[PDB]
Design a binder for this molecule. Structure first.
Ligand SMILES: CC(C)=CCSP(=O)(O)OP(=O)(O)O
Length: 301
């Protein structure tokens, strides 16, 4: 029963994470997994936890695990620091999450882990605030401020989260996609073509019009948007658009959850052409999807 029968919730989680990774051919490191769970296993059992797979072009599927909780302080940072998961790089990322929590009150935070790497991100979730609140933050890439006109033009006025990617050396600003123009396929064409990104099929455009959340990625090495992502939730296995892509089908049908019918969150990423790929998270305990609708002032579907 090393991995079966009666077991703690945390051990069930670990076993499920490894099974997913093996099934999708994701790489992982046993030492990294152990290191993550020593620090964070208890959080994973009691809060909004998700397992993600994503399929970047010309590489293996990546398997991530992640959680969030409604605490005002960035509890992940002290945990990751003591676990040895978060070393200073001599870089703006090093102080960025601390600056985010200083500059804007959080109502929640989270952390994200690639099981082949360690801690990849920490999230800051304020209440929805004007995007200009982010310009207070010292270490934000200069590109962010430079996109003020872009944000206004595409109704990216309502900031709903921030993140720091320690691995990629980037930061995402997340927006509440409230504006009725964001219910039209033309919006998505236009925002993508504004950055010279790949425009997806009409089929996919028709899915994007339900997107409540738009992420925009910025970095310190270039003046432009690195990639953007449109997030859409589905309240059960069957409603995921399994026909769009085999990873969506397989994950929807096979992803483990401790709850008997989980929902999913799908991110549709686009970049130059790479940055164009799909991310899918299983709502392992069933907390994440309701919370996603609630945070965007949407009734649950
Ligand atoms: C759970 C929600 C609504 C957003 C999470 S941010 P993310 O993991 O998709 O960020 P990246 O893929 O690292 O850009």
């Amino acid at each position: 029963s090393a991995g079966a029968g009666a077991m703690t919730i945390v051990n069930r989680i670990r076993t499920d994470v490894v099974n997913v990774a093996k099934s999708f051919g994701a790489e992982y490191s046993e030492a990294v997994i152990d290191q993550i769970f020593q620090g964070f296993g208890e959080k994973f059992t009691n809060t909004g936890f998700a397992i993600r797979v994503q399929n970047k072009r010309n590489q293996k599927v990546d398997c991530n695990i992640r959680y969030g909780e409604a605490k005002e302080n960035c509890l992940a940072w002290d945990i990751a620091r003591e676990s040895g998961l978060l070393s200073d790089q001599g870089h703006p990322v090093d102080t960025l999450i601390q600056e985010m929590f200083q500059a804007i009150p959080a109502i929640a935070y989270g952390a994200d882990f690639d099981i082949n790497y360690g801690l990849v991100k920490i999230w800051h979730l304020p209440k929805i605030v004007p995007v200009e609140e982010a310009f207070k933050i010292p270490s934000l890439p200069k590109s962010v401020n430079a996109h003020i006109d872009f944000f206004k033009k595409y109704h990216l006025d309502a900031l709903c989260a921030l993140t720091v990617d320690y691995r990629n050396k980037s930061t995402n600003l997340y927006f509440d996609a409230h504006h009725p123009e964001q219910r039209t396929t033309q919006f998505y064409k236009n925002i993508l073509q504004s950055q010279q990104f790949e425009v997806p099929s009409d089929e996919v455009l028709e899915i994007l019009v339900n997107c409540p959340e738009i992420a925009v990625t910025f970095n310190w090495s270039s003046p432009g948007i690195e990639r953007m992502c449109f997030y859409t939730a589905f309240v059960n296995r069957e409603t995921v658009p399994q026909h769009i892509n085999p990873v969506l089908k397989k994950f929807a049908q096979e992803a483990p959850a401790l709850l008997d019918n989980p929902g999913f969150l799908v991110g549709w990423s686009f970049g130059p052409d790479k940055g164009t790929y799909i991310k899918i998270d299983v709502d392992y305990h069933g907390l994440v999807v309701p919370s996603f609708f609630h945070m965007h002032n949407l009734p649950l579907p």
